[PDB]
Symmetry: C3
Subunit: 218 residues, 3 copies
């Protein structure tokens, strides 16, 4: 009937008004979307995450803090001795220098203990060794010799670094070597030195200011 038409039409009109409120406008939705970033070619400002672990090796983003930490973490290890270390035999007898203090990059399996460099991660590395061999007490030898090498007792692989010799050991010489040396993970690496001197009497060669540190390079 007449009144019937009124009622049913008013009912669906109410639904139309409910749809109006419950739904989103073209312009409003477009504005909200423009507020966000497109998946491709996304551009943003003042965007930040939580820094992933330094050891992280994935496609995840790195934060400025992350690069700060990483670059500083290429130092690998560092060890030094303050004072003098005796030499047992001046006849090309391999001996391992000691270190009262040492430091190591953390989070890579590296550890320095008992004057040992644990190679936490293998790869290419840069090694810089500087020490001083000197004689104190007695007559300085008429001839001196001291080779510098990255030796390893048991394997004896002595990467020859340098051989400084001179007949004025009474005041000591400083050996300096820098070069590229590769290493494999889990290796217990230590510094070996051999000294040979002829002549003199009551003389004992002395090793001091021993610097031993590495650098990580892939």
């Amino acid at each position: 009937d007449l009144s019937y038409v009124n009622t049913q039409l008013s009912a669906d009109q109410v639904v139309l008004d409910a749809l109006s409120s419950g739904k989103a406008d073209l312009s409003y939705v477009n504005t909200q979307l423009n507020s966000k970033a497109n998946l491709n070619g996304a551009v943003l400002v003042n965007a930040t995450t939580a820094t992933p672990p330094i050891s992280d090796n994935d496609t995840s983003l790195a934060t400025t803090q992350h690069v700060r930490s990483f670059n500083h973490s290429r130092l690998a290890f560092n060890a030094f001795r303050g004072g003098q270390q005796g030499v047992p035999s001046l006849s090309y007898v391999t001996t391992t220098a000691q270190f009262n203090s040492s430091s190591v990059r953390s989070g890579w399996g590296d550890n320095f203990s008992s004057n040992r460099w644990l190679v936490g991660e293998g790869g290419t590395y840069l090694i810089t060794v500087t020490t001083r061999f000197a004689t104190v007490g007695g007559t300085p030898p008429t001839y001196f010799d001291a080779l510098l090498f990255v030796g390893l007792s048991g394997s004896g692989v002595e990467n020859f670094l340098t051989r400084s010799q001179s007949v004025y050991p009474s005041f000591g010489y400083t050996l300096s070597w820098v070069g590229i040396l590769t290493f494999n993970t889990g290796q217990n690496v230590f510094l070996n030195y051999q000294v040979n001197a002829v002549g003199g009497g009551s003389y004992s060669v002395v090793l001091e200011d021993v610097r031993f540190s590495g650098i990580q390079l892939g």
Copy 2:
């Protein structure tokens, strides 16, 4: 015959159709949100952002340019002397080595003026020094001694580094050293060297081709 009721029925239909036309559909929005938008925990593509300043340490995202700039900024100074310099006194007198040219990284306060380096950023640094001492004129000494240490301004600190002693300075000796040191922002650092030599006569020990460069580690 019904009249106004059917015309309002039809009027409602018009508004209803316009309502649908000016709205946001499910299918439409889903496509924008999934294949053409970024989520949280998203997987992204090769997009771009703004380059953060090197000075920052926040968790903002780093760009390849930022990595380049930060890794290249890890030198922080390099001083070089061209020519020659004479040794003032051969009595282990604390002598401040002088420099002709220097360069420092920007954005950290590092400075190399008056032959003294300023610590722009307090922290650990790797310092390398290469000095050359030669005897010119007179008779070569029967004893030549040169001590190298990291002089701190206002103290003449004897941070002993190297002492090369040989009695053949007739042509020239080059002393080089590399090692790790720590410093704090605001500490004025210049290379003080003590040189002593005995024997000979009317000779002149000349310091030349001095290099004093420090590369930051940590």
Copy 3:
């Protein structure tokens, strides 16, 4: 006719119910958007991108892989000699030591060919050189002289680095040098050494353990 209105109302209802089912509903839309990543205040649990090429310098985001590679990529090159070679002339003869093995970083044009380092990329590089000159057999010369300098192909720049001298060179002297050098793109660079010895007889001079390597510092 009520059937008339009923069929037209059924048409209205068809549109109504279709547009109701197929539409984006506000609460759900807001939920999804909140799940999405805001462009300005972007803070995401994690996110990944294709590892951009190491050479990239745009404002594209950096990956942990990229950070590792670039630092590892900053080695520039390396050159090493295995075995011993004889020094041809002790007469200040400009001689370029040859190399048996050498590696370069990829993706920069760097190449080490003909025992000469081609500067793939211009910039500031830290150069590391280690050479040993030793006299073998017969009478060691009464004096020795060996200049170490970075000769430059095409230009003839024998950058005086260090000079190795001794009166008993029968055991070798390794005056390894380190410092900061600048180079322009495409420059072909080698290393030249001039050796002069005085006195002695029936002695052969040997060059051994030649390491030549640099790293692209800032």
